[PDB]
Amino acid sequence: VSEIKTLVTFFGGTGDLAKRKLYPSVFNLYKKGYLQKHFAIVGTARQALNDDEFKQLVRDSIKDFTDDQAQAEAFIEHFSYRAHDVTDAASYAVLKEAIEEAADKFDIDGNRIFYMSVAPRFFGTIAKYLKSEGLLADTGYNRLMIEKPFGTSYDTAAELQNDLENAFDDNQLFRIDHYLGKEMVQNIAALRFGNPIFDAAWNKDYIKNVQVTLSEVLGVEERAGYYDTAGALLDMIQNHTMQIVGWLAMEKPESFTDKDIRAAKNAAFNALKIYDEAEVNKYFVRAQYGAGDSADFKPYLEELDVPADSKNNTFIAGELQFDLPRWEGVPFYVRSGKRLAAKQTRVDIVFKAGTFNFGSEQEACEAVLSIIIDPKGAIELKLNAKSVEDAFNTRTIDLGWTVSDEDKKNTPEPYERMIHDTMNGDGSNFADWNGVSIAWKFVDAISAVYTADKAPLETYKSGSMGPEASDKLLAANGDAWVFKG
Amino acid sequence: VSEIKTLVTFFGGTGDLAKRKLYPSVFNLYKKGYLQKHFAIVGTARQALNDDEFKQLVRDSIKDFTDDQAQAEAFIEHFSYRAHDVTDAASYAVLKEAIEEAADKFDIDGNRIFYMSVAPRFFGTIAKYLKSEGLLADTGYNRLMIEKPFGTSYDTAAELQNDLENAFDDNQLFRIDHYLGKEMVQNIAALRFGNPIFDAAWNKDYIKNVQVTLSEVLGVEERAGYYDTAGALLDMIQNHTMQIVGWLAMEKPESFTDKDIRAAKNAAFNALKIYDEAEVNKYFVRAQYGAGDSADFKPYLEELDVPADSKNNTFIAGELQFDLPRWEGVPFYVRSGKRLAAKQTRVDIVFKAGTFNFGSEQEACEAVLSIIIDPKGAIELKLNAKSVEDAFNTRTIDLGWTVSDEDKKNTPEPYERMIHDTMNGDGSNFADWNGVSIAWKFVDAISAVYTADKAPLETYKSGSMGPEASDKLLAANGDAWVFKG
Numbered sequence: 001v002s003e004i005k006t007l008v009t010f011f012g013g014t015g016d017l018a019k020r021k022l023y024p025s026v027f028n029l030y031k032k033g034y035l036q037k038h039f040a041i042v043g044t045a046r047q048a049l050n051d052d053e054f055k056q057l058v059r060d061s062i063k064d065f066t067d068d069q070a071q072a073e074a075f076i077e078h079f080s081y082r083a084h085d086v087t088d089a090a091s092y093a094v095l096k097e098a099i100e101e102a103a104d105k106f107d108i109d110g111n112r113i114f115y116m117s118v119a120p121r122f123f124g125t126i127a128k129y130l131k132s133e134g135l136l137a138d139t140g141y142n143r144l145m146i147e148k149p150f151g152t153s154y155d156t157a158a159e160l161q162n163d164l165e166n167a168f169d170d171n172q173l174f175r176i177d178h179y180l181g182k183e184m185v186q187n188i189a190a191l192r193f194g195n196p197i198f199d200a201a202w203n204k205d206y207i208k209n210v211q212v213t214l215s216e217v218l219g220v221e222e223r224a225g226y227y228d229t230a231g232a233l234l235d236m237i238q239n240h241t242m243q244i245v246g247w248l249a250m251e252k253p254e255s256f257t258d259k260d261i262r263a264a265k266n267a268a269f270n271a272l273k274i275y276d277e278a279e280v281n282k283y284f285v286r287a288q289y290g291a292g293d294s295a296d297f298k299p300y301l302e303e304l305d306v307p308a309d310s311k312n313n314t315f316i317a318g319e320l321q322f323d324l325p326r327w328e329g330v331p332f333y334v335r336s337g338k339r340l341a342a343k344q345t346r347v348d349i350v351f352k353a354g355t356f357n358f359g360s361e362q363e364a365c366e367a368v369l370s371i372i373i374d375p376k377g378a379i380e381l382k383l384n385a386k387s388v389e390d391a392f393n394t395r396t397i398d399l400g401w402t403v404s405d406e407d408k409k410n411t412p413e414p415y416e417r418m419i420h421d422t423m424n425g426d427g428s429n430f431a432d433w434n435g436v437s438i439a440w441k442f443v444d445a446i447s448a449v450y451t452a453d454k455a456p457l458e459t460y461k462s463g464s465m466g467p468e469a470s471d472k473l474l475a476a477n478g479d480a481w482v483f484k485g
Numbered sequence: 486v487s488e489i490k491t492l493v494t495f496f497g498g499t500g501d502l503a504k505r506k507l508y509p510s511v512f513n514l515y516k517k518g519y520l521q522k523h524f525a526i527v528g529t530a531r532q533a534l535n536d537d538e539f540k541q542l543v544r545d546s547i548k549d550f551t552d553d554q555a556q557a558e559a560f561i562e563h564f565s566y567r568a569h570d571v572t573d574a575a576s577y578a579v580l581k582e583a584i585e586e587a588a589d590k591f592d593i594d595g596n597r598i599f600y601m602s603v604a605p606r607f608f609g610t611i612a613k614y615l616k617s618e619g620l621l622a623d624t625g626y627n628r629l630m631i632e633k634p635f636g637t638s639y640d641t642a643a644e645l646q647n648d649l650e651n652a653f654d655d656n657q658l659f660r661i662d663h664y665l666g667k668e669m670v671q672n673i674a675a676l677r678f679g680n681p682i683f684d685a686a687w688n689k690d691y692i693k694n695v696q697v698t699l700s701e702v703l704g705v706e707e708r709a710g711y712y713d714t715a716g717a718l719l720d721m722i723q724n725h726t727m728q729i730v731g732w733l734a735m736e737k738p739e740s741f742t743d744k745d746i747r748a749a750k751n752a753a754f755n756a757l758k759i760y761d762e763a764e765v766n767k768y769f770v771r772a773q774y775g776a777g778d779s780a781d782f783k784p785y786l787e788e789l790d791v792p793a794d795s796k797n798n799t800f801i802a803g804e805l806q807f808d809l810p811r812w813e814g815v816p817f818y819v820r821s822g823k824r825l826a827a828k829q830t831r832v833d834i835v836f837k838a839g840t841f842n843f844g845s846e847q848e849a850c851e852a853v854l855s856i857i858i859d860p861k862g863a864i865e866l867k868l869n870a871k872s873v874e875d876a877f878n879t880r881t882i883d884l885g886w887t888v889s890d891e892d893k894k895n896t897p898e899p900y901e902r903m904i905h906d907t908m909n910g911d912g913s914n915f916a917d918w919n920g921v922s923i924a925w926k927f928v929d930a931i932s933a934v935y936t937a938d939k940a941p942l943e944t945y946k947s948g949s950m951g952p953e954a955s956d957k958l959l960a961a962n963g964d965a966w967v968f969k970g
């Protein structure tokens with residue numbers, strides 16, 4: 001294929017994410033013939049390590065991904081390490097050395113990507129010294145990959161944006177969101193724009209409501225310390241859920257270039273309504289899991305590191321409103337929580353019921369287009385047909401499709417897609433500042449209420465699909481969650 | 486259920502159709518609790534038979550449909566026979582007797598259905614004497630069920646219509662067409678009108694072309710004598726194919742009453758264009774099967790009773806044009822032939838390809854909605870999605886649905902539907918005069934050409950899906966048959 005000439009620097013190169021997801025993803029791009037001669041990977045962290053010692057760390061990361069050892073050993077020759085304190089300007093000179101040493105050794109003309117798998121407080125500092133200490137390439141491109149999370153509130157997000165803006169341009173900033181890097185999610189645009197019958201129907205005159213579901217069957221497990229302060233609201237809703245909503249709510253672009261794609265998404269984001277105390281209580285529902293029917297499924301308050309008086313949300317559900325001609329009055333429902341009935345990430349477009357009177361007892365019901373993203377990709381379409389009865393009557397049938405095994409292990413995991421796309425300069429599957437600022441303003445209004453506790457905290461049994469309020473929320477507009485479990 | 490009080494008279498009550506399809510169908514309506522006390526079945530034909538002897542004929546017809554013998558014996562008590570010459574006015578008095586004897590015995594107030602399973606030349610005569618010899622009920626309803634065929638040309642059809650019009654009103658005349666009585670065919674209206682996304686797309690701005698396919702894998706087998714003069718044109722195209730096209734081409738009705746349904750269909754029929762010699766050659770293709778790759782699959786000219794110089798068509802394919810705003814320029818392709826690749830009766834709505842440029846190598850292709858009627862009902866929908874590749878690209882996926890076993894043997898066979906519908910006065914699944922006259926005018930223009938041999942007779946190997954001209958026909962408008970075999 002066309003060789004990808006690039007140099008990647010991994011900050012936090014000894015961390016678990018680097019070992020478990022980053023290196024294997026890079027290794028695959030080598031296996032697929034993208035990365036060949038002209039490429040180098042410089043790892044960096046606070047721990048001391050020999051170039052010999054680092055290579056073994058990488059050798060371990062890809063052990064399970066290795067078929068031909070000679071192939072692995074060849075890939076590993078492109079790796080170098082350097083111990084480094086990110087808060088020390090003088091220490092960056094050592095890092096610049098390793099980077100330029102690599103650029104010479106493999107003959108790479110610029111094209112540098114800086115990945116930051118470090119704690120969120122080091123983001124601004126690092127970005128600053130890459131520019132001032134001369135690490136940015138004078139030729140080719142310079143791109144920065146910012147890990148999750150990009151702020152914890154609009155204010156902190158804006159600060160980060162400002163710090164980063166001091167060394168890079170917005171189009172060089174690649175904010176990570178693994179959900180946006182999921183193959184099935186990228187099908188949304190193809191299904192809509194690729195088929196006129198759906199394209200011309202993606203509006204208020206055809207849709208009754210839209211549903212986004214990021215259901216998890218796991219509890220807090222071990223990340224309770226950090227989670228208790230974030231909750232489902234900032235952990236799944238603010239980031240993953242809002243960005244999926246962006247692909248669904250967006251206007252029709254003028255082209256499929258990332259520039260127009262974002263213009264189309266931002267048009268919708270700029271129309272999203274921000275709620276006040278009263279609206280939050282009416283449109284949103286927060287809850288936390290209690291014990292299920294199994295003693296093994298203990299309540300949230302009994303999890304390790306969780307404070308006994310915690311009013312944190314392990315589940316969130318609510319209605320979104322877009323003040324756009326296209327979505328005038330159409331409800332966008334979203335939900336995400338832990339200890340639910342099943343692991344599932346899906347989108348459900350509920351079309352309006354037809355008004356053609358068939359004279360029958362059972363008249364036409366609402367059609368549904370479902371796009372299952374996790375655990376396994378699948379596309380279903382519920383349509384109205386005739387019942388197998390004597391007197392003419394209608395019923396709903398489900399047409400379905402599921403990814404083949406050929407499709408499955410041939411599909412690129414999110415981290416590979418993101419790294420690959422950054423190397424190609426394609427920001428199509430990445431969130432931009434405008435999208436992130438709006439999502440933060442949306443979530444902040446809600447959090448303020450919760451923080452002040454001017455809204456109730458519901459409860460639900462571990463194993464259900466949420467509290468009953470979640471159902472009542474939709475019933476008010478005459479709707480119901482498609483996925484029941 | 487609500488009891489159906491009716492009296493049915495079967496002309497040709499000793500024939501094969503009566504034994505194989507008519508009586509079992511009636512028996513089912515008894516089994517389903519529709520026919521109870523107030524109903525009688527008077528058989529009639531030219532052969533002499535005791536009421537005892539006739540009952541055994543019926544006892545045989547339903548043998549394979551009998552579970553509880555006591556149930557069968559109870560059904561059989563409603564049957565009576567009378568030998569009768571249909572060309573003898575004086576003989577009708579004997580028939581009137583049996584009918585009134587039955588009306589008294591089971592207490593039936595009129596509601597008479599007269600079924601004619603006799604040779605087409607007796608149709609007019611019979612109808613005449615039912616009125617003049619006083620067999621029509623003075624109360625309730627009087628309906629006549631005319632078997633296939635209703636004429637062999639427009640002229641002969643019109644004559645039949647005139648003769649029948651002398652004793653009945655058009656709405657009392659139920660013309661038989663078992664294809665229109667097929668469960669899946671009746672789904673067409675539900676899929677279209679029942680789902681707005683399809684309803685608003687059933688026009689020229691969305692559809693590229695429509696395909697109707699009545700494929701048969703059998704050859705002439707034994708009915709070669711009658712077939713050699715009819716061909717696929719009058720055997721499958723004129724009747725079955727045109728009526729399925731009627732459900733597809735029809736306008737949106739003002740209600741689902743049979744009156745409006747027909748008004749909607751007739752609106753399309755009245756717009757169907759009739760071809761001249763030149764147009765027939767361009768838009769239609771006729772052919773007859775030769776030997777396949779198997780010696781066992783002998784050519785048409787080697788079939789029993791087929792003349793060695795026969796220029797008869799065992800296969801027909803062509804393009805239909807409707808001069809209606811709704812279908813302006815949209816081609817309706819139809820095909821039917823013997824000795825083809827597989828037994829199949831389906832409809833394929835080919836939607837236009839989208840023009841949204843994805844920047845990809847493979848741009849959006851045309852979506853397809855397929856409704857499989859025979860051998861087993863199924864609904865498929867080909868949509869555009871994203872390919873499992875690295876660079877963004879589209880591909881076509883097939884979403885499918887198939888009738889369950891629960892649905893299958895629970896579904897009413899065509900003859901049961903037709904008889905039942907006639908008892909209910911529902912002409913929705915029946916062709917009317919306007920539809921039949923147009924189909925005849927359409928086919929006559931074509932036959933005139935063939936009869937004069939001013940068009941070529943193609944050939945095809947037994948087992949293919951037709952001659953190559955069939956493909957070229959669609960290629961001209963940039964189309965292709967969806968079903969390949």
Ligand SMILES: O=P(O)(O)OC[C@H]1O[C@@H](O)[C@H](O)[C@@H](O)[C@@H]1O
Pocket residue numbers: 178216235345374
């Ligand atoms: O479906 P996936 O990719 O496992 O995503 C779920 C995970 O998404 C991550 O973003 C959250 O931090 C985790 O808490 C969560 O479990």
Ligand SMILES: O=P(O)(O)OC[C@H]1O[C@@H](O)[C@H](O)[C@@H](O)[C@@H]1O
Pocket residue numbers: 663701720830859
């Ligand atoms: O699909 P079906 O109902 O068997 O229909 C096919 C038959 O239809 C009948 O109308 C024709 O006279 C037969 O020649 C033909 O074989």
Ligand SMILES: [Ca+2]
Pocket residue numbers: 476477
């Ligand atoms: Ca409301």
Ligand SMILES: [Ca+2]
Pocket residue numbers: 961962
């Ligand atoms: Ca043409």
